[PDB]
């Protein structure tokens, strides 16, 4: 196999990053170091037109947690975007 996600990330232009950087911030509005733990993410949901629970939210974090830290970062989050590039399944 290969890395269709890790590759895209590196192959990102200021045009895209500039967008991702947006959420990253709102996804960590109130963080201590600069990560996510639902507490912050969920905050956006309510605005996104939804509101996931703290027990499930983890999914949005475990979906891109290749460190075992629990929180998402510019490394894990970014990928969280590539995985949801375009819907064509």
């Amino acid at each position: 196999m290969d890395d269709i996600y890790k590759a895209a990330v590196e192959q990102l232009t200021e045009e895209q990053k500039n967008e991702f950087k947006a959420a990253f911030d709102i996804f960590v509005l109130g963080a201590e170091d600069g990560c996510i733990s639902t507490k912050e993410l969920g905050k956006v949901m309510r605005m996104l037109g939804q509101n996931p629970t703290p027990e499930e939210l983890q999914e949005m974090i475990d979906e891109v947690d290749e460190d075992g830290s629990g929180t998402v970062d510019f490394d894990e989050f970014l990928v969280m975007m590539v995985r949801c590039m375009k819907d064509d399944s």
Binding site: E19, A23, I26, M47
Partner: peptide
């Protein structure tokens, strides 16, 4: 949950697409 497309419209609907 939620597609980047949607998270890009709400969270950051401005300066997008």
């Amino acid at each position: 949950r939620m597609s980047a497309d949607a998270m890009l419209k709400a969270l950051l609907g401005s300066k997008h697409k």
